[PDB]
Design a protein around this nucleic acid. Structure first.
Ligand SMILES: [Zn+2]
Lengths: 12, 332
RNA sequence: GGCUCUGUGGCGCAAUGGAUAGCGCAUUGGACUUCUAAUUCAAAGGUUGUGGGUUCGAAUCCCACCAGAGUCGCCA
């Protein structure tokens, strides 16, 4: 997959 | 609005988050199947028609998978590496013919070399048993390796009695923390100062899980465990799935940058599918393999879908159509 | 991720050069103390891996795999 939201996000 | 590292555009759309404290197979399967899209430890209801990056979900079945040359190449790479070991250090950079003979005599010579001889195989005296052929066999036999006359190795897939009282879990916590923080820093810098007790707990320990009550006389193990990898004196643990007896869904996990050229992450999915097939073949009805999330503007999605053919479904339909029909309209 | 070069059967692959093809060590034949110069040569094998293709034949050309080595790459 390819997504930029996953790599940079203030959540877990 | 989260970041879109892609085609530049002003995108406005949100998958509103939600979460319910009631875990059941029907609840979770509905909340992942009806229509949904999530990124995180939450269930999000997607309302998404505003973007420049198409999205879609794909689900497959194990009835049609067969090995290919690339699969053989990766399997051979992994096997040779694990067996013979490697310590590399990367760096940046006389009689003559006649015209009539040439044609007719040579064609007839080939024909009369093929024909006049006794050469034929004869044998006539659920079905994934088979051993009678001069043919290569499937990957099932190669799942387990063979070792020479020496004692230095380890291969095993051990079940995890999931209960937060063990020494291995504590070490795995730190190992995964370091691995994924390093991976995040490498791929794209993200503030790691948020690593606290609650943050790490929700990141790793927390997950939608429930116990399974078998209404049978069982001699087997029920799969909600972790998968490990064997290396020098530091063991890895990468695997996440909870299986009530109708479910097959695995969530992605992080890897160290070394894995980009030494690991088999893609083959991990095939290995887990083989394990599920092995545990299901005994006595059960299960054709379930649901893992799909793609932002596709590239030639990668064809390679991803090579796992096909498989049945497709949009949320207005009641007939299982093979992916071939849906191939052109959306894929091309 | 595709493709580059190698294709007898245990080993070696010698045959090949624009009208191009198979062999050296165990071995069935001479003899008993002694034997890989106790010789030496005469011997058991065959769609040079298949389902097929094109210049006349391909060995030399090609799709898919079976056997092997490989730069640079990737969304894990
Ligand atoms: Zn975009």
């Amino acid at each position: 997959d390819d997504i930029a939201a996953l790599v940079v996000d203030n959540g877990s | 609005f989260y970041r879109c590292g892609y085609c530049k555009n002003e995108s406005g759309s949100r998958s509103n988050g939600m979460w319910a404290h009631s875990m059941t197979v029907q609840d979770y399967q509905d909340l992942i199947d009806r229509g949904w899209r999530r990124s995180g430890k939450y269930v999000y209801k997607p309302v998404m028609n505003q973007t420049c990056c198409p999205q879609y979900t794909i689900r497959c079945r194990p009835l049609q998978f067969q090995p290919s040359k690339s699969h053989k190449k990766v399997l051979k790479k992994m096997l040779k590496f694990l067996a013979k070991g490697e310590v590399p250090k990367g760096s940046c950079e006389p009689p003559c013919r006649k015209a009539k003979e040439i044609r007719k005599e040579r064609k007839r010579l080939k024909l009369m070399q093929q024909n006049p001889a006794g050469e034929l195989e004869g044998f006539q005296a659920l079905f994934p048993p088979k051993a009678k052929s001069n043919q290569p066999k499937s990957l099932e036999d190669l799942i387990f390796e063979s070792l020479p006359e020496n004692a230095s190795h380890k291969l095993e897939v051990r079940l995890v009695p999931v209960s937060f009282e063990d020494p291995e879990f504590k070490s795995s916590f730190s190992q995964s923390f370091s691995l994924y923080v390093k991976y995040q820093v490498a791929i794209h810098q993200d503030p790691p100062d948020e690593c606290g007790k609650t943050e790490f707990t929700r990141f790793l320990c927390s997950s939608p899980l429930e116990a399974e009550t078998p209404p049978n006389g069982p001699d087997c193990g029920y799969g909600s465990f972790h998968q490990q990898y064997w290396l020098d004196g530091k063991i890895i643990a990468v695997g996440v799935i909870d299986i009530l007896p109708n479910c097959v869904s695995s969530v992605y996990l992080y890897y160290d940058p070394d894995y980009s050229f030494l690991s088999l992450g893609v083959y991990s999915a095939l290995r887990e599918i083989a394990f599920t097939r092995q545990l299901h073949e005994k006595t059960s009805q299960l054709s379930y393999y649901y893992m799909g999330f793609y932002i596709h503007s590239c030639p990668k999605m064809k390679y991803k879908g090579q796992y096909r053919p498989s049945d497709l479904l949009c949320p207005e339909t009641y007939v299982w159509v093979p992916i071939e029909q849906c191939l052109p309209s959306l894929e091309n």
